[PDB]
Amino acid sequence: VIVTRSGAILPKPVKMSFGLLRVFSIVIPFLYVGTLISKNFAALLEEH
Amino acid sequence: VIVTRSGAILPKPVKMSFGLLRVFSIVIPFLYVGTLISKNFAALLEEHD
Amino acid sequence: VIVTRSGAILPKPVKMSFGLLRVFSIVIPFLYVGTLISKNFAALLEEHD
Amino acid sequence: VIVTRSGAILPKPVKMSFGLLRVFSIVIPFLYVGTLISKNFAALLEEHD
Amino acid sequence: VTVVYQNGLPVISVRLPSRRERCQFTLKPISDSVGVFLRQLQEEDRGIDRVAIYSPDGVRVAASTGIDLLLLDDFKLVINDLTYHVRPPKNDVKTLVQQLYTTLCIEQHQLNKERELIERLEDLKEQLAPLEKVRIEISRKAEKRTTLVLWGGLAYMATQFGILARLTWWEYSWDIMEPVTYFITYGSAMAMYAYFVMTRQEYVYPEARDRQYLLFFHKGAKKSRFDLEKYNQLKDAIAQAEMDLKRLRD
Amino acid sequence: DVTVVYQNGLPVISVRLPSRRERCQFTLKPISDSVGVFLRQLQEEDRGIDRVAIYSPDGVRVAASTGIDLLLLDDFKLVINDLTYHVRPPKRDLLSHENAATLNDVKTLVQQLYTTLCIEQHQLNKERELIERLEDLKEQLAPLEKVRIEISRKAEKRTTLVLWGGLAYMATQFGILARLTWWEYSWDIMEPVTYFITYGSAMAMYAYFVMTRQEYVYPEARDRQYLLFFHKGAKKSRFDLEKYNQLKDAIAQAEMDLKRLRDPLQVH
Amino acid sequence: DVTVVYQNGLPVISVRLPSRRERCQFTLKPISDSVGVFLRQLQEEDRGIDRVAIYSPDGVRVAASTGIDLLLLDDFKLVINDLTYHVRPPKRDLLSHENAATLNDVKTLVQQLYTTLCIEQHQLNKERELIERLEDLKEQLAPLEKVRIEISRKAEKRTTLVLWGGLAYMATQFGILARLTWWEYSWDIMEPVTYFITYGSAMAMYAYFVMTRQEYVYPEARDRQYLLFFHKGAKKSRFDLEKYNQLKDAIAQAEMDLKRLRDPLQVHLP
Amino acid sequence: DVTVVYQNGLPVISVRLPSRRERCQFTLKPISDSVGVFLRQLQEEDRGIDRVAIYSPDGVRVAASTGIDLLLLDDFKLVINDLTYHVRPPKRDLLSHENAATLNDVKTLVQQLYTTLCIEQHQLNKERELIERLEDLKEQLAPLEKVRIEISRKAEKRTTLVLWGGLAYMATQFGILARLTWWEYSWDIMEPVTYFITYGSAMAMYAYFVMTRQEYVYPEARDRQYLLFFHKGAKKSRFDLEKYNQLKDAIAQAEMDLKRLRDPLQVHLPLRQ
Amino acid sequence: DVTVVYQNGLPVISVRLPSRRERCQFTLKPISDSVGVFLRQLQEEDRGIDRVAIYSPDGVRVAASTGIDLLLLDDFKLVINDLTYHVRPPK
Amino acid sequence: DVTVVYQNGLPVISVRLPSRRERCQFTLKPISDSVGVFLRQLQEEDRGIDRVAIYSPDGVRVAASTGIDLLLLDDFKLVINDLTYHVRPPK
Amino acid sequence: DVTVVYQNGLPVISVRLPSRRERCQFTLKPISDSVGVFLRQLQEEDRGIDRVAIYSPDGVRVAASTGIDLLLLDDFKLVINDLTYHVRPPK
Amino acid sequence: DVTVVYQNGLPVISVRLPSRRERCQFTLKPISDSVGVFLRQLQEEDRGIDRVAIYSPDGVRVAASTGIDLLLLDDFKLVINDLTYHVRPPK
Ligand SMILES: [Ca+2]
């Protein structure tokens, strides 16, 4: 799994370009827009 | 996964004909059966104990 | 995979030695011993303080 | 998994030298680190607030 | 007597007259003969007044023939007076000159096949390219539409956290939203079972995206009129030619 | 006299043994036997030979390491006890010491022998016999396919009835607690019932490991249940279930032998 | 009279014997047994037999290494003590004279051409060439072996540090969450924190799938870490890994070809 | 006067012998032959030779297992009983740079023509020898299986008992929380213990991966424990096991060879390797 | 036909042996030789015969150390492989 | 041809063996030697002879225990391999 | 050449063995030693020889059981591998 | 320096052993023993020597089968690996 059948070494694994910031700069605005609609819905639930 | 060992493309994976409505129409009536079977068991259990 | 490469049919899988009626009678006595030792401990730490 | 393709028996797999000592000698001091790292946390957050 | 070689060895078992003992013997088909069979027979017991094995034609078979040469036919086993019948479980020059004729017509035939296979491997790669130019763009559209499903499922994962996070710390406490947070988990279990029963495939992450990729590819293959039945025929016929040209080398 | 003539692909050497004064013939393999094996095989046949040896025609003894094939190229002198026999019957008529002139007689002989023995008809006869077997095997299975399909079409329906019944079980078990614990009842009673149902599922998924000797996954259980409905359902219809997977494993080998015969790389 | 009957695809020879006026049958395979094994068996079966011979239709003696199927072409005389039995097995050969001389003329000429210019020595020379090439490539692997094994023990040590640092993280959370539900807070305060940690973990195991195109299985997220540390170390250690990879791939092909050539079923070498 | 002559691409040495006072000629194979059995052959040709030796005229003694082509270039010294000779081979030319573009293909063609004619009466011989060897290995196997079945009757039984014991643990842990939350103490005080039991299970599943490189899948655990119990019991019964698995591999190799030999003997199609 | 002829004061038995279908004559020295020597000179001379014994009073096997002087005074039925030869001695 | 001539009190037998075509002589000690030893000094002097026998009354075989001097009084036939020599020793 | 010396009655024979060309001499007890003992000592001291025989009247062959006390009366040829030494004895 | 003593009616050979420096003695019955039997004994007693030979009549070599009792009539150069013992036996 690290070596091939012939004992050779597997190639270098692929990584996506500049990726940790690409997965980190999506969660935060989608964590604020999961927080804003909480109050937007709850303050109408506490009226109707 | 998507490409065969020669280089071709796999055929379409078969979906069920009238797929989602069977799930959506077995979940709802047995949810109502579990709705009825709870209260009409509690009506037996609350008054005899 | 239930059909092999030659189109044939895999052999029969077997249930073991009336397993349904002995799993059912091995899950109960250890549960009885468990509730016994739990009551023993919940009284013994009250006697030990 | 027991037998090979031939019918021969697979050799005895390796067991780690001093393994079960090395797991507890890392669990226990870091349980104490996780104890001391948050006994001094609530007192600090009560002192500041 | 009886012959069974389900053990790999034909188990014969005979009793002498007036014995109580039904002795069983192990005899090989390849390195055992009649001779040491009778010697292993007659070192055991005492009823060796006579011993013989006749043919079913009555004539004695010689005591140095093979066991697989013996039990392929019947035989009358004869000890001192008693008879045991046994029921055991029951162009080569033309092929040589064919091999010797096809030995001469390989060095010309492989050369007659190699240039033809290079010709077809060039014509199919000429065929492939105006399909490949369309297929790369359709695959790019399917790639983008699959990537917008992956990062969009991440959005639902990150939005459910916020809607469960504002209530249970500002407005609705945990003791009257804990039943909601249990049943979202149980509804997440029922959906993972319904995806199994509705598609006949286990819900794992690297297979579900390569399920949605093939849906987002075969919706776009017809809507841009990509004749896929041509493409998976050319891609088969190139690699099948290449596996043959690999075999012509060694 | 001592002679040697080629019979059946091999040289046959005749010799005159001293005791009983009777001739013998020796059929000796040229590529494997040395000239020591032949001189042992002489003394086996007549034990009254004390000295037996082979001389090169110019003196020197051809020693017992060389091959018969190396020794039948040129003549030699056999010496038995006291007598001599200079034997030159090998008669190597090839006078070329050239490659192509000797190789292009072989294609003449083989191409003559290809036409005299009607072998291309034999090749087409074998290629006919293979499909003649395969169409017998395709017809033994053909009436009995229509009960295997009959059993499969029922076991499929029973497996589908198991699967949607399980989804209905979860759809009912959701609804019981959903009806109780929000408004019909308390929440703080239905929390340990929830925890113990979630632990009893983990207990039953281990009991399924014990009673089956495999792991509980979704597509590795319905296939077991389909096969267990197939064999029970085929007990009742009694269609020689071993004959089906005995016939498939012969058609799947004649079908491969036809592909390996018709291989366009080698002329068969 | 001595009889020979073909049974089962084999011969069966029934002989009258001198020491007991009876008959016995001998069964023997024409492809392995010779004349000197048949007469040895006939010498073994009875004792009073003291001279055995097989002659030709002429007076000449067939020797004791002739194959049986090179003897069952014509009729032949069998000599036992002082009698002379005459045996005629059935002529079944089905191959005409020019059709048995042409293939003979092929065989003798092929054998002379095989002997004339020592083809078996050139044959052994190829195996010599392969067994030298294989060793000269295995010797070139030997400088790269130490250079590989140092960066390999470095990467194994670093991934062992990573694996145990996972478990230290797994424990230092269990300490924090056990102090603060029981000593200087209660469970009514630290109840949702455990839920959001066990949900953030389930979301980080999805972010791991979004970054690298695989799931978070425990060995599958170990092999990747080890091999990526291997390449980021072996770049800075500065050995050309392509010369390792190509040569190590060539070893297992230049040995598999040698095993194909030394196949004891498929005669190439003596 | 001892001469080395190249006949038919082979060295032929003419040596004078003391007993019969006659020259004998040896046809030495260059590549597949050594000096140490060249001297054995020279001793087989004449019993009268007491000692025979050979060396380079500046070294001490050339040793055995030396190929003939190393020896066959220097003018080297030969020593028979009380006599000494010093012989010189001839230099060998090479025409193969241009003239043998045909000849290197002629050799490979005539070798194919030989292995076409040879293999029919070889396949049957190797098949009969192989089916004799297979039955030899079966007969040698048949007593040794008894100790293995004796061990595997017990090392299986302990694994079955530890599976049922794990199920008993999983039942008792269900019981001792049920009695302690529905009869004696609250749920809302035995809830964090209920949480940490699941968390400690999730941590022990990780420590199992750190100890041995396994995922802890349920059939991947008992089939690791079975081998530990088996090699534990193999010390107990003092069973010899390397002969056992070597003998099983020797049977499987013969089965693979018979499966390959089924094709040319019955179908008369080519063989694979 | 097993015959005993006195010549040079000694018996010369003539026995028919079944390997070569021809006769064979002996020379017995009755004072020195016993029955066992005469029985050894049959399995030595012809190795085809394998069972041989002597029945003088028509009933029993005669002992293997009887002298020929203590044998020739009556008949002795001689058994070869399955053949029985009744003999008569000269007197 | 096989001849017997007395030399110094011992008979000398001149036989022509068939392996080499030479003549060979044998000096016998007629009292202590039997025919079973004279038939063994032929097969080791020449290993090429495999069946050698002696026929004294010109019809029947003589077994290999008869003394040499009983054979030398009357003429006989010596058979070697396939040749039958008709000998006649003198008085 | 071969020399035979009567040393106090005991004959001593000096023969040149052809393996290593130095002479060897043999001493014989003329009653207990026969031709088969002397030729075995020739083949047993030197092992390079593989045919040896003794031809007394220059025509025929002496056997392997003649005593040397009968051979030393007259002159006899002695052959070794390809050599024929004619030795003349003292009388 | 070799001094041989006759003892109990048989010679006793005293050999200077040149590898391990001692002087050993034997006991020889030269019928079932011989010269080569004695030459085996010097390699067996002193296993440090390898070359041994006996040149008796001042010219030539003795066989490995002559008895010492037959060798008593002449002197013998008993030679070991690189030495010489030019001794005369007792009479
Ligand atoms: Ca809770």
Short mmCIF file of N, CA and C and ligand atoms in Angstrom, two decimals, chain E residues 174 178, chain F residues 187 191, chain G residues 187 191, chain H residues 187 191, ligand 1:
data_model
loop_
_atom_site.label_atom_id
_atom_site.label_comp_id
_atom_site.label_asym_id
_atom_site.label_seq_id
_atom_site.Cartn_x
_atom_site.Cartn_y
_atom_site.Cartn_z
N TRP E 174 -31.14 24.33 25.98
CA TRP E 174 -30.85 23.00 25.47
C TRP E 174 -31.93 21.99 25.82
N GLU E 178 -32.94 19.74 22.61
CA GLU E 178 -32.40 18.38 22.56
C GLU E 178 -33.26 17.34 21.84
N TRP F 187 -40.46 14.95 27.89
CA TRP F 187 -39.18 14.65 27.25
C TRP F 187 -38.26 13.88 28.18
N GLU F 191 -35.79 10.06 27.22
CA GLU F 191 -34.37 10.09 26.92
C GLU F 191 -33.66 8.76 27.21
N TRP G 187 -23.17 18.98 34.75
CA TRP G 187 -23.48 18.47 33.42
C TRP G 187 -24.49 19.34 32.68
N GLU G 191 -23.38 20.06 28.77
CA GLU G 191 -24.08 19.10 27.92
C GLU G 191 -24.00 19.44 26.43
N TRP H 187 -31.65 9.41 36.06
CA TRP H 187 -30.99 9.48 34.76
C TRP H 187 -30.08 10.70 34.67
N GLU H 191 -26.07 10.27 33.55
CA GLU H 191 -25.90 10.63 32.15
C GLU H 191 -24.44 10.87 31.72
CA CA M 1 -28.26 14.42 26.57
#
